[PDB]
């Protein structure tokens, strides 16, 4: 009956942003002021909804999306932003109704010599639609010559590694991000506070 937010926020490992994870939250009582009230977060921005307000409402579903990005990119996880993350990795809609939460995860996701397991999509012909998730790894053709699945000049693997090392500047350090979005169609309302 209690929403499994700890499953999301306290997960041992987080997804790369291009392959962002979505948790569906249903048939539970939430309570987000206990979640919000937590000096443990560097970002906690809500759009539409106010936080102390969410304890009052009933949505028919809630999604918790989560992933890791660089400190400098957290600002792209907002309605109306552009840049490599918003354009080609994770895109919020202009009329987004939800909250974006982020915290510095340098003490978890960095390694001496660089942790290279977290990736972002660098190359993509078109912008993602909101809440679109592109996990293709096709070689990206930047020129006129077909790649035939082989990397080379003008034929680039589309995903690139972050290099998370502990002494990086804060803008280059990993941040774990959770996006909560609130779903109200017309049916049962299975998630309340």
């Amino acid at each position, epitope marked *: 009956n209690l929403c499994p937010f700890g499953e999301v926020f306290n997960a041992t490992r987080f997804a790369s942003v291009y392959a962002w994870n979505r948790k569906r939250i249903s048939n539970c009582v939430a309570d987000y002021s206990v979640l919000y009230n937590s000096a443990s977060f560097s970002t906690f921005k809500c759009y539409g909804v106010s936080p102390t307000k969410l304890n009052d409402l009933c949505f028919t579903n809630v999604y918790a999306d989560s992933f890791v990005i660089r400190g400098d990119e957290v600002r792209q996880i907002a309605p109306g932003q552009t840049g490599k993350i918003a354009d080609y990795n994770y895109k919020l809609p202009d009329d987004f109704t939800g909250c974006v939460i982020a915290w510095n995860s340098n003490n978890l996701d960095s390694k001496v010599g660089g942790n290279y397991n977290y990736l972002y999509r660098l190359f993509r*012909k078109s912008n993602l639609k909101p809440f679109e998730r592109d996990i293709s790894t096709e070689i990206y053709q930047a*020129g006129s010559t077909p790649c035939n699945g082989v990397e080379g000049f003008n034929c680039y693997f589309p995903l*690139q590694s*972050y*290099g998370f090392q502990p002494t990086n500047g804060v803008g280059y350090q990993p941040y774990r991000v959770v996006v909560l979005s609130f779903e109200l169609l017309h049916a049962p309302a299975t998630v309340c506070g």
Partner: antibody
Amino acid sequence: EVQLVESGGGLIQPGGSLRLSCAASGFIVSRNYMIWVRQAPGKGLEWVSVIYSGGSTFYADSVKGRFTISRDNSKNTLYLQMNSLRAEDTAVYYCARDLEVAGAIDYWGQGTLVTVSS
Amino acid sequence: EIVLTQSPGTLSLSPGERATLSCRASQSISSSYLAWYQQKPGQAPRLLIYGATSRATGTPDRFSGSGSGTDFTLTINRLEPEDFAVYYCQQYGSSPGYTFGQGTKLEIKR
């Protein structure tokens, strides 16, 4: 052969407008990060603008609101539209293809000289 | 925003010697986001190194990149007359997305 050929630079009065062109061969402009970089006489390099394959654009503070980067897919050409030109915009303007962590700025056009003077 | 400060401003060395060019960043950046260029007079810049250490197409082994954080170095072994140029460093990880150093001008003695 792969290359970037620039044109459009020349003399323009302060307050006037010029459009620079960058015709590409090989590279598909609309599939790349494409940039403009300028170099005033005797000075260093200054990044000016970038356009993403998905169409996002960004600008240096020194040109924001006056310059517009754009492209024409059918001509495979990159443009820079410069308005309200000032004396300090006088420079050689380069277009170039950017690969970011996959290779930085690996190909540059030859440069076209813009002179802002009355 | 980030500033890249190159030193020395000017350098003059004999053929066969080794030039050491420094690039210092005002804040720590990941080495994945630093590159070096060579610009000879009348020409566009030529990419030498990207990602601090990776050699671009056509860059011979006598050009070597190193560094991390706030301190990067370009080394040019076995200098020759055609190495006369201005050398620039460049970051592409921090706001506004592209910044260049002010350049080191290399003269080749004879």
